[PDB]
């Protein structure tokens, strides 16, 4: 389904913070003893509303809340870190969790080059 922002207002600019795991460290700053404190591990960025993605994101997080709350009610885990990994697993199982029937709608195998390699013979 498409994303319909239905909020009273939308800040179209997204001034964000995050971290990076593959930080190109300079010298010895990767060593915890010498590295930055907890407050200085962040990078920043600014993203505008091209393709209306910012307003879409705000609407997307709003609509995620119900499903996400019901998931957290049903888990016994105090802190959940596994959602994204589980979605990568479900991505693979949706495609490769059964026999892949070539040229079927639920099998992502392109046989074109092998079909053309057969035509040359």
């Amino acid at each position: 389904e498409a994303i319909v922002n239905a909020q009273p207002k939308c800040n179209p600019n997204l001034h964000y913070w995050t971290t990076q795991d593959e930080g190109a460290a300079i010298g010895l700053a990767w060593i915890p003893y010498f590295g930055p404190a907890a407050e200085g591990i962040y990078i920043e960025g600014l993203m505008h509303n091209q393709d209306g993605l910012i307003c879409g994101l705000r609407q997307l997080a709003n609509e995620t809340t119900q499903a996400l709350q019901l998931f957290l009610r049903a888990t016994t885990e105090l802190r959940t870190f596994s959602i994204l990994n589980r979605k990568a697993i479900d991505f693979l199982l949706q495609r490769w969790g059964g026999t892949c029937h070539i040229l079927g709608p639920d099998c992502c195998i392109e046989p074109a080059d092998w079909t053309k390699n057969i035509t040359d013979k």
Partner: protein, 237 residues
């Protein structure tokens, strides 16, 4: 249904349909998946302390729950609560190990005072989350800075200044809550919803420079005569 996942199709964001399979969709590593958190601020909610606190409530019987998120938005308004019952017992639990405050706040609204706290935990009455440092919780922790927000999950396509504003509160979490803005430990201003963060700082600086702080040992309280989103006793008139 299940937890929605955002993806970019046709120069627009959409929710991925689980029932249908798109082989043109390519996911090459777990780095292409991200959890993000967005601030209620950005949807136009009133952020003044009287309005924001009316969205939180105490409830028993519901265990707290925490989910992580990898990236967040710079907030204009965050909150930090130190609420006791009238008997002096704490209303909010100590921050669990590893839960630090929201990392980017322009104004931290620190609120101290009392209330009935008729519940084991403080939840968001609208279902939103309390956003901490890359952890989103369903409940408020004591003395820990948070922003109100909601979480999204995505498939990616293949200086900093902070200022604390202190308030005193009686009857926290009720229909008839009283708020005072703190100038010093003996000078307060009757808080109203219309007072933006910038206006309170100017009021504080003008009280300090005009000598309207209490020059006694007792409590002085001012009232201010009546005389848009952020990104776009006595008297005084």
């Amino acid at each position: 249904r299940s937890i929605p996942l955002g993806v970019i199709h046709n120069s627009a964001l959409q929710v991925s349909d689980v029932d249908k399979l798109v082989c043109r969709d390519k996911l090459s590593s777990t780095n292409q998946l991200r959890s993000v958190g967005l601030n209620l601020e950005g949807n136009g909610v009133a952020t003044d302390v009287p309005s924001a606190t009316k969205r939180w409530g105490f409830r028993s019987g519901v265990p707290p729950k925490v989910v992580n998120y990898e990236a967040g938005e710079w907030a204009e308004n965050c909150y930090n609560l130190e609420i006791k019952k009238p008997d002096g017992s704490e209303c909010l639990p100590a921050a669990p190990d590893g839960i630090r405050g929201f990392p980017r706040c322009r104004y931290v609204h620190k609120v101290s005072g009392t209330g009935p706290c008729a519940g084991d935990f403080a939840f968001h009455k609208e279902g939103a989350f309390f956003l901490y440092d890359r952890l989103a919780s369903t409940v408020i922790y004591r003395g820990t800075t948070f922003a109100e927000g909601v979480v999204a999950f995505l498939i990616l396509p293949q200086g900093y200044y902070s200022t604390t504003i202190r308030y005193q509160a009686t009857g926290f979490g009720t229909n008839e809550t009283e708020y005072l803005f703190e100038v010093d430990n003996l000078t307060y201003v009757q808080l109203e919803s219309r007072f933006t963060p910038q206006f309170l700082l100017q009021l504080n600086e003008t009280i300090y420079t005009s000598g309207k702080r209490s020059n006694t040992t007792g409590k002085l309280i001012w009232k201010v005569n009546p005389e848009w989103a952020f990104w776009e006793x006595x008297x005084x008139x």
